[PDB]
């Protein structure tokens, strides 16, 4: 069966994670059945603010990797198309000109003009039942008496969002629409427009909105709704998609999915009607997994915008990533731990430095400096001055790493250059 879906978001300044989730559902439905998936940008005006917003949505779309068929459709490039359908409804007396204000209509609905530019409103047939079988909620019915004559064209002639969606959906042959429960009230209004223009009504799937940790609606008050913020936070594109597709959808008790697995087992009949919650632990658990399943060369290219240290080390000097990969969850956390090893310490932790015998620690490091200088690149040496390991390992760690609980001293000596290790010990003695 041929499936034609799209992603036509309402005007936003960027790509929201909630909109990314909806775009994934619509994407997966088309790709699972070898259909077509489009991206439509609805710019109500050709201003500088809306041009940058469109580029931002396209930017996040490219980074995530959701490819679309054909070229991107813009609302500003289809101005004359929307005008003709609006005129058609007028000439058929299915739409009419209105000069009243909203406050006048609110009072009248509860009980040759000169100058004033009118708006165009659609004539909603009263005393009818608008119904549609939603793929998630089931049969949804609404009386037309609960729908007033809504605006389809403003006083300057510009069509509304609902009119632009249904025209573009009919001209593109959209067969299914997977939507969030937020826009559930716009669906009956779109159905009116569809029937008025004798257009085919695609199938609808209304999924619950994403909830936060406290069960509230996911909004800008949480502080992480822009998809490109997750890129700056250090999350991989594969982990972000795996996280969002799991909200409101579940297969067979599985948590990790590849792109080829989703494309071969996604089904909109499995969309859960129970709302899902946004979990930082779940997203980090996924992102830790995809980060650990990466290679070594790819990690070098991923860690470049996050690490202050340039990687000119040898293939074994991959040992740096072995110890930090398991203890890191994002590229930001991984690169920071890397900088804690490659970048030389500028200061020393006074919590452990002040509680150290300076008369005994200084000559002991020198005896090890020469003992290690004879060796090179991987068996280390142990001091034999009849002392515990802590009496020697704690000062050596402060000289090499400066902190209290970092990587093991055996790996840090090999990761760092044999000349760099001596340069750090000599700086500790100064």
Curated annotation (Swiss-Prot):
Which residues make up the binding site for ATP?
220
Motif annotated as 'HIGH' region, chain positions: 9-19
Q: Does the keyword DNA damage apply?
A: no
Where would I look for the motif 'KMSKS' region in this sequence?
217-221
The places in or outside the cell where this protein is found are: Cytoplasm
Give the protein's function.
Answer: Catalyzes the attachment of glutamate to tRNA(Glu) in a two-step reaction: glutamate is first activated by ATP to form Glu-AMP and then transferred to the acceptor end of tRNA(Glu).
The family classification in the record reads:
Belongs to the class-I aminoacyl-tRNA synthetase family. Glutamate--tRNA ligase type 1 subfamily.
The EC code for this enzyme is 6.1.1.17
- List cellular component terms (GO): cytosol
Tell me what reaction this enzyme catalyses. tRNA(Glu) + L-glutamate + ATP = L-glutamyl-tRNA(Glu) + AMP + diphosphate
Q: Does the keyword S-adenosyl-L-methionine apply?
A: no
Subunit-structure text:
Monomer.
Q: Which GO terms describe its molecular function?
A: ATP binding; glutamate-tRNA ligase activity; tRNA binding; zinc ion binding
Any one Pfam family here would be: tRNA-synt_1c
Q: Which UniProt keywords apply?
A: Aminoacyl-tRNA synthetase, ATP-binding, Cytoplasm, Ligase, Nucleotide-binding, Protein biosynthesis
GO BP terms in the entry = glutamyl-tRNA aminoacylation
Top-level lineage group? Bacteria
Q: Which InterPro entries does this UniProt record tie to the protein?
A: aa-tRNA-synth_I_cd-bd (IPR045462), aa-tRNA-synth_I_codon-bd_sub2 (IPR020751), aa-tRNA-synth_I_CS (IPR001412), aa_tRNA-synth_I_cd-bd_sf (IPR008925), Glu-tRNA-ligase_bac/mito (IPR004527), Glu/Gln-tRNA-synth (IPR000924), Glu/Gln-tRNA-synth_Ib_cat-dom (IPR020058), GluQ/Sye (IPR049940)
Q: What is this protein called?
A: Glutamate--tRNA ligase 1
